[PDB]
Amino acid sequence: TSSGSEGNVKLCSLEEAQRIWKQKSAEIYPIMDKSSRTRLALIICNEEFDSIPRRTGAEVDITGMTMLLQNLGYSVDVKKNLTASDMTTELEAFAHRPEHKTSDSTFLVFMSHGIREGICGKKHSEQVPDILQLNAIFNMLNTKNCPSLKDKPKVIIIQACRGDSPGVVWFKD
């Protein structure tokens, strides 16, 4: 039933959980006890922009990702329509959250327009770029800047264009 906390996410049974833990030795990331852990996730989504087309349908993505991460046991913070500077400030704040200490992992979700160089902030234009680089995201969440997430999986998901090309070539059979 999808009426439970995990919603539409298929459950891992106790037998399946024991089998995975037995098949592989010490090659799995440790999971903290459900009763005590404080898992955190962050979604940054830009839909409305100053100078580039509106990202119609973004709300569907926000809903889906928020519910999915909650299903997986994460407390989700949702921030909308930020400049690259605002994204940096939000990421730095996320890295400083005390909950990461009592967490085993984190998810970061970015959804915006994008170019080859990175992710577009709300104020982005060709004349005055407003870009957050993927490199900056990694740096802000690494062991130096986020010691609380040492040894813990940090999953970054990015929905964005990475250029203008269609991504295809022709071939004949």
């Binding site: 298929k10 799995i28 459900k34 349908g57 993505d61 889906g64 690494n142 040492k150």
Partner: protein
């Protein structure tokens, strides 16, 4: 006592397309990569690690249509398999 740790470890990034290329989005149905990722996570989080799941997402894009894109996994320093163990 102080000890050394790797500055960058246990990261995985998953992008909606390959460099230089567009990612697609429907005005009422949302982004295809996001929708596909949710579906695969809902289905496979119980039995597959996240890296395995991301590969399956990629595979679902294998046959190109009118709006082709190829999700890319980037800058991976996962030293272990990350199983979500949903329900636990």
């Amino acid at each position: 006592a102080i000890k050394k740790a790797h500055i960058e470890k246990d990261f995985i990034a998953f992008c909606s397309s390959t460099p230089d290329n567009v990612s697609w989005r429907h005005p009422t149905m949302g982004s295809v990569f996001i929708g596909r990722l949710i579906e695969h996570m809902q289905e496979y989080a119980c039995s597959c690690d996240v890296e395995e799941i991301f590969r399956k997402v990629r595979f679902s894009f294998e046959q190109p249509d009118g709006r082709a894109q190829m999700p890319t996994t980037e800058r991976v320093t996962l030293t272990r398999c990350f199983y979500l163990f949903p329900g636990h």
